[PDB]
């Protein structure tokens, strides 16, 4: 690993391979070979854009007792999940989501912020989840949510899709997984090579 951080043999003949571009970068399969380098610089934070969250719901979920929806009383909702989003400067915001069941095959979804000091607790339903007779999501599984500002940062609206959900009596209710394509900034700390030649940075 020479002065300019280029993978090179013991004599000075720089190593070559398929260059990778994108975010997340992908190996351009047919690209012309080019020298492979290891930039010590840091990659800038990318704001959350596509957050997804699966959930395992129950058919026998009771209707909430207190019909006025809120965020204080735990009885106001049947299910509560949470995800994390990133601003344009690497700040982390917490997005809460509430599922309530009015009747069968129909659910109401309410988003909420928990980091903005100027975020008033809402009651409007973010969306509706419609389900099959067997417990398969019908539609209403695509939402766009914008956060607020945090110490001089602009919000980043992300697409929240409750894809491949199900409500088929999994006992209680629980989220299968949460994810997105946003990340904080960070500096290079370690690099490796997999058993298929794809050089990996950490």
């Amino acid at each position: 690993l020479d002065e300019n951080r280029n993978l090179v043999n013991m004599q000075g003949m720089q190593l070559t391979g398929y260059p990778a571009t994108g975010t997340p970068p992908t190996i351009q399969q047919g690209a012309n070979p080019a020298p492979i380098t290891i930039p010590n610089t840091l990659m800038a934070a990318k704001s959350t854009t596509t957050a997804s969250m699966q959930i395992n719901l129950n058919s026998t979920d009771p209707v909430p007792s207190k019909t006025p929806f809120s965020v204080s009383d735990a009885d106001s909702y049947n299910k509560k999940g949470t995800v994390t989003v990133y601003d344009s400067q690497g700040n982390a915001h917490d997005m809460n989501v509430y599922f309530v069941k009015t009747k069968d095959n129909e659910w109401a979804v309410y988003t909420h912020d928990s980091s903005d000091p100027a975020a008033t607790a809402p009651t409007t339903a973010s969306t509706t989840l419609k389900f099959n007779e067997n417990g398969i999501l019908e539609s209403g599984g695509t939402v766009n949510i914008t956060t607020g500002t945090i110490n001089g940062a602009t919000a980043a609206t992300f697409s929240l899709s409750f894809l491949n959900s199900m409500q088929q009596n999994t006992g209680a209710n629980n989220i299968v997984a949460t994810n997105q394509n946003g990340y904080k900034p960070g500096d290079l700390v370690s690099y490796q090579i997999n058993n298929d030649g794809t050089v990996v940075g950490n």
Binding site: L1, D2, E3, R5, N40, D187, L188, V189
Partner: protein, 50 residues
């Protein structure tokens, strides 16, 4: 010190190189910064790369 106080006299610097196995030995168990070996690239103890 002898009055229930503490002082700092400096910090140990760890100079990571962008190129290991490129340093040159100039005597005892000691190397010197050379070309094809990297700049000093100073740094503290526990911060990140070190």
């Amino acid at each position: 010190y002898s009055n229930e106080q503490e002082q700092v006299l400096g910090q140990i610097v760890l100079a990571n190189f962008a190129n290991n196995e490129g340093l040159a030995s100039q005597g005892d168990n000691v190397w010197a910064a050379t070309q094809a070996s990297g700049v000093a690239l100073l740094g503290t103890a526990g911060s990140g790369n070190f």
